[PDB]
Amino acid sequence: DKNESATINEMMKHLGRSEGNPVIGVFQKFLTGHPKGAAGAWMMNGAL
Amino acid sequence: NKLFVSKEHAPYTDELEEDVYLDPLARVSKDKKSGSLTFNSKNIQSKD
Known part of the structure; x- marks a missing residue:
């Protein structure tokens, strides 16, 4: 959660995302838990 | 046996890890001191 936060934050910082316009995090695994392989397919379904 | x-x-x-990851033109040079191939800050986000 720290590594991920840091890498997203640095992606935005480098591409000059506006100060005061943070991305809004969703953490779907709070509800579902972590199904290994399927983890990202559930996140995609949620994104859609 | 090597x-x-x-x-x-x-x-x-x-x-320099993030800096190298974020400059697509960043290449490695022969470190004069060590003799091994390393990324120098001189060649990262470099007008040249």
């Missing part, structure tokens, strides 16, 4: 020699270090220091 066809395989494991690397102790990435070609970037931890300090």
Whole structure:
């Protein structure tokens, strides 16, 4: 959660995302838990 | 018995890791001191 936060934050910082316009995090695994392989397919379904 | 020699270090220091990841033109040069191929800050986000 720290590594991920840091890498997203640095992606935005480098591409000059506006100060005061943070991305809004969703953490779907709070509800579902972590199904290994399927983890990202559930996140995609949620994104859609 | 040395066809395989494991690397102790990435070609970037931890300090330069993100900088190298974020400059697509960043290439490695022969470190004068060590003789091994490393990323110099001189060649990262470099007008040249």
